Amino acid sequence: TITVLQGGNVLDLERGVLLEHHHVVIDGERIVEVTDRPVDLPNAQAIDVRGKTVMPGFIDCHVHVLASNANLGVNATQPNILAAIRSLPILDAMLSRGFTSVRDAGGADWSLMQAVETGLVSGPRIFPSGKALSQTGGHGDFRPRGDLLEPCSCCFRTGAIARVVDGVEGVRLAVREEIQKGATQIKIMASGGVASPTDPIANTQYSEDEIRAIVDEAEAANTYVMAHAYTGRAIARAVRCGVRTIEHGNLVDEAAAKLMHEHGAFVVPTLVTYDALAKHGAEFGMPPESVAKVASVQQKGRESLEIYANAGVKMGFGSDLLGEMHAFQSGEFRIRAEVLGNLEALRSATTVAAEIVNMQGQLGVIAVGAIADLVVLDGNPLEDIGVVADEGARVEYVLQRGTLVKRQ
């Protein structure tokens, strides 16, 4: 019932310090005490965490757990069973890197959420988007330029990241469907992307009437809309139509970022995926015109991080890795810390991330009352982001809802 971490170096993220020789006391699934006083441990089971960093469990705000290979066109067409199977090693690897919670950006449903919560499957807590919503010819339209046949399979394929739905009532019905299927939030494709063969990244997707409808039907279900957009043009219209988070956001202007502050909109950049698709683009089986499109978004990637920071736009942690590139997930910690410094790179995974998933008091912080999603780390992350960003080299313990899940 009760577990004690002893002599830990507790990371207080808002105060920006390592509280050494602090004990974390856990009862069931929740943190009951943080103290430097000698704890009366009686019946309680103890883990000795002397001279090691105790910090909250990471929250990757942008994953594709069901992206078992780098070609998303071919990923959707794989058998339903095989699709499900192949996501299990991905989920297991994510947890052992420290990610106790993930926000799936398209693919994962409520079944995978239960699988992890029931303990039938090992891995992070999933906040599923269901399928992503995409227009015809959009970023989730993986049909060739050949000709157009109707896919009722868009919902049926468990390997499919997105579905194709168009029209105000069509997208309205789509949202109500995805919510009752069990989704925690709604994904949409608000602009062109890199993976889909048909659309350039410069141009916008969905009419403002569609986007507003999707927002309103998410808000009515006590949730929000996460939106894929690159250009500041596309980001402006998404946020003015009332989306809560912007994915990637690589090619913002400072006027677009100023509006995001002014609406209270978050951004989850995913810079580690483009640097992966640089070295291993068509090398891992992606279409050449997608690899030709990946060369341009990375350039203004680290640049945009400053732009959001100037404007005061809260930034979350995202990987967006596909297939065998999933192992590079922790590498985003490094990439972020270079530009913004480690404290802010750790805030992306913890306190900001937990606000994005609407679990502010519950997750991403070691406080009395919060869920026991904890990482025991060897060495200081504030003094060295390498103790986090070396494929999770220096994480020995992962605790999720009280119970210890990983030992290394």
Provide the binding-site residues for a second copy, judged by CB under 8 A: 77-82, 84-86, 109-112, 114-115, 120-121, 135-138, 141, 143-149, 151-153, 155-158, 166-170, 172-173, 176-177, 179-182, 198-200, 202-205, 207, 213, 216-217, 220-222
Residue 60 or 320: the one with the smaller Cβ distance to Zn ion is: 320
Q: List, in sequence order, every residue forming a beta bridge with 163; answer none if it has no partner.
A: 133
Structure tokens at 202: 């410069």
Beta-carbon contacts of residue 310 (< 8 Å; ≥ 6 apart): 254, 257
Applying CB under 6 A, among 123, 138, 159, 193 the residue interacting with ligand LWY is 193
User: What binding mask, one character per residue, do residues 261-300 give for Zn ion by CB under 5 A, x or -?
Assistant: ----------------------------------------
Q: How, if at all, do strands 125-128 and 99-104 pair?
A: parallel
Q: CA 181, 187, 192: angle at the middle one, nearest 5?
A: 140
Question: From the list Zn ion, ligand LWY, a second copy, none, which binds 168 (C-beta under 5 to 8 Å, kind-based)?
Answer: a second copy
Calpha distance 16→105 (Å, rounded): 30
For 9, list phi and psi in degrees, rounded to 5.
-100, 90
- Residue 326 carries which DSSP code? G
Give the count of residues interacting with ligand LWY (CB under 6 A).
11
- Which range of residues in 41-49, 189-197, 208-216, 323-331 is near ligand LWY by CB under 6 A? 189-197
Question: From the list a second copy, Zn ion, ligand LWY, none, which binds 203 (C-beta under 5 to 8 Å, kind-based)?
Answer: a second copy
Question: From the list ligand LWY, Zn ion, a second copy, none, which binds 115 (C-beta under 5 to 8 Å, kind-based)?
Answer: a second copy
Residue 241 or 322: the one with the smaller Cβ distance to ligand LWY is: 322
Question: From the list a second copy, ligand LWY, Zn ion, none, which binds 37 (C-beta under 5 to 8 Å, kind-based)?
Answer: none
For 157, list phi and psi in degrees, rounded to 5.
-70, 120
CA–CA distances in Å: residue 256 to residues 21, 44, 93, 138, 265: 45, 52, 36, 22, 11
- Which range of residues in 89-97, 122-130, 187-195, 238-246 is near ligand LWY by CB under 6 A? 187-195
Return the percent helix, strand and coil in the chain, to nearest 5. Answer: 35, 25, 40
Q: With binding defined as CB under 6 A, does residue 273 bind ligand LWY?
A: yes
CB 133 within 8 A of CB 187: yes
Q: With binding defined as CB under 6 A, does residue 228 bind ligand LWY?
A: yes
Length of the chain, please? 408
SS3 174: helix
CB 225 within 8 A of CB 244: yes
Q: To the nearest whole angstrom, how small is the minimum distance from the Cβ of residue 105 to a second copy?
A: 17
Question: From the list a second copy, ligand LWY, Zn ion, none, which binds 180 (C-beta under 5 to 8 Å, kind-based)?
Answer: a second copy
CB 163 within 8 A of CB 131: yes
Question: What does R_g of the chain's alpha carbons equal in angstroms?
Answer: 21
Applying CB under 6 A, among 13, 126, 190, 195 the residue interacting with ligand LWY is 195
Q: With binding defined as CB under 5 A, does residue 105 bind Zn ion?
A: yes
The residue ranges that bind ligand LWY (CB under 6 A) are 64, 105, 139, 161, 193-195, 228, 273, 320, 322
